[PDB]
């Protein structure tokens, strides 16, 4: 086509979605991790994670307001990944990299799994 | 902080939200324009438009599944702006610029209003 494109549009949309999350506006699901609860928007979770995409396209699960993750999932690792979903920023540190990579593998967030693998390989 | 950032994350999120819109997945509102109906996600509409942000933060309207726009709004102008919200791409043409600018002013999409004003000024 002959469209023009606003370079900062996608980033501005994501910043506003994160502002809605902060203020708990139109959040439609609670993700439960080892008795730690995280409110989010189903559409953002689906756009970022192969696992949530599969969950919320299921005819029965699409209607659930609460999702319980596998008990092996670390709440801090989940929190870091939820922040990444809404900001593009990943708080990757020596002390959390193993939990973050394990959580990203479970959530099916291929780009996060890739950078964790590379950061681990650099330290060996 | 000491975060790393994935450059293409915001664009990838928006592309996936547009794929959900195309497949009518988790759309939670119908926007009615001169008897033309457009399904969308409330959160994406709020992230892009000052008008929808005001509508869906209202305690009564946040619960509506149908929103009727002012009868002066042109369905094609709305369609072009809805496409822009989900893609960052604006199909601005000599034949639609007046309807697009009028719709963007009503929806409170300041960056679109800005480029329409500049494109009109260049043709005078």
């Amino acid at each position: 086509d002959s469209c023009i494109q606003f370079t900062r549009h996608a980033s501005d949309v994501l910043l506003n979605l994160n502002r809605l999350r902060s203020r708990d506006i139109l959040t439609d699901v609670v993700i439960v991790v080892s008795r730690e609860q995280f409110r989010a928007h189903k559409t953002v979770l689906m756009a970022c994670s192969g696992l949530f995409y599969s969950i919320f396209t299921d005819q029965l699960k699409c209607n659930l307001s609460v999702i319980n993750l596998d008990p092996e999932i670390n709440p801090e690792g989940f929190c870091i990944l939820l922040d990444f979903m809404y900001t593009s920023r990943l708080n990757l540190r020596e002390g959390n990299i193993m939990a973050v990579m394990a959580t990203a593998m479970y959530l099916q967030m291929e780009h996060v799994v890739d950078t964790c693998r590379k950061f681990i390989k650099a330290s060996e | 902080d000491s975060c790393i950032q994935f450059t293409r994350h915001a664009s990838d999120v928006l592309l996936n939200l547009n794929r959900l819109r195309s497949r009518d997945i988790l759309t939670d509102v119908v926007i009615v324009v001169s008897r033309e109906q457009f399904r969308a996600h409330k959160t994406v509409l709020m992230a892009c438009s000052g008008l929808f942000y005001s509508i869906f933060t209202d305690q009564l309207k946040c619960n509506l599944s149908v929103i009727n726009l002012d009868p002066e709004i042109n369905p094609e102008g709305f369609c072009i702006l809805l496409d822009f919200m989900y893609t960052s791409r604006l199909n601005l043409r000599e034949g639609n610029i007046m309807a697009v600018m009028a719709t963007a002013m009503y929806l409170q999409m300041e960056h679109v209003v800005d480029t329409c004003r500049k494109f009109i000024k260049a043709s005078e």
């Binding site: 023009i4 494109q5 370079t7 | -």
Partner: peptide
């Protein structure tokens, strides 16, 4: 704004 840019030409994509």
């Amino acid at each position: 704004w840019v030409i994509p």
